[PDB]
Design a binder for this molecule. Structure first.
Ligand SMILES: Nc1ncnc2c1ncn2[C@@H]1O[C@H](COP(=O)(O)OP(=O)(O)O)[C@@H](O)[C@H]1O
Ligand SMILES: Nc1ccn([C@@H]2O[C@H](COP(=O)(O)O)[C@@H](O)[C@H]2O)c(=O)n1
Ligand SMILES: [Mg+2]
Length: 191
């Protein structure tokens, strides 16, 4: 059987990583955060390491050739699992590179979009920046991430939305109120 994939999209700090951990716990899917995979590769001392570092700091999207490879390696090592790919696709290139490399290998079911206001994401991110130790949790990078989201990623969401493949969860609530709807959706989808 081909894996099922759900793209988990949303703004910076909309809660994609938080809710994905809940889904892993209750449904046993594998959580692939693209942001985490890219950081990991950078921590590993690769060729692409100093490039990844600069782009993350400035809220730019890394070349897909790096990201899709990192996702494919993890997916190929976990035969028989379903996948939450978190924070991807974030632009058209991301999307095209996915469909070029993955389309006959997986079943991408829907985009789960966490909708949250910028003001709330900014606050969540400054708070997370006190302990995360991420290079992009400050208020310079945060605002760069917002622009990239607005200019590149919103187009991807509306592209899936015309094929009816976006589910929207409003994310400006308690973490458990948000998870209740997420759990209900995954149950209603037969997972
Ligand atoms: N519903 C929520 N309400 C308040 N804090 C939240 C909520 N969801 C997540 N957080 C906090 O917001 C920050 C961003 O969450 P995270 O899941 O890491 O975001 P993302 O992966 O979308 O960038 C974290 O510190 C997290 O603990
Ligand atoms: N598809 C993706 C996902 C993450 N990223 C990079 O990783 C950064 C951190 O993303 P996360 O917030 O998802 O960890 C993004 O702002 C971006 O610089 C990327 O370049 N391509
Ligand atoms: Mg995250």
């Amino acid at each position: 059987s081909k894996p099922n994939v759900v793209f988990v999209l949303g703004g910076p700090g909309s809660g994609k990583g938080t809710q994905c951990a809940n889904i892993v716990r209750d449904f046993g899917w594998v959580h692939l955060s693209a942001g985490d995979l890219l950081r990991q590769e950078q921590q590993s001392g690769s060729k692409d390491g100093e490039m990844i570092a600069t782009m993350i700091k400035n809220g730019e999207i890394v070349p897909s050739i790096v990201t899709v490879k990192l996702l494919k390696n993890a997916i190929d090592a976990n035969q028989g699992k379903n996948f939450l790919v978190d924070g991807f696709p974030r632009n058209e290139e991301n999307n095209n590179s996915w469909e070029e490399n993955m389309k006959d290998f997986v079943d991408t079911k829907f985009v789960l979009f966490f909708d949250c206001p910028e003001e709330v994401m900014t606050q969540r991110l400054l708070k997370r920046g006190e302990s995360s130790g991420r290079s992009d949790d400050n208020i310079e990078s945060i605002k760069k991430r917002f622009n990239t989201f607005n200019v590149q990623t919103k187009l991807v969401i509306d592209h899936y939305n015309k094929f009816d493949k976006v589910k929207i969860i409003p994310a400006n609530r308690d973490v458990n109120e948000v998870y209740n709807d997420v759990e209900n959706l995954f149950k209603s989808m037969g997972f």
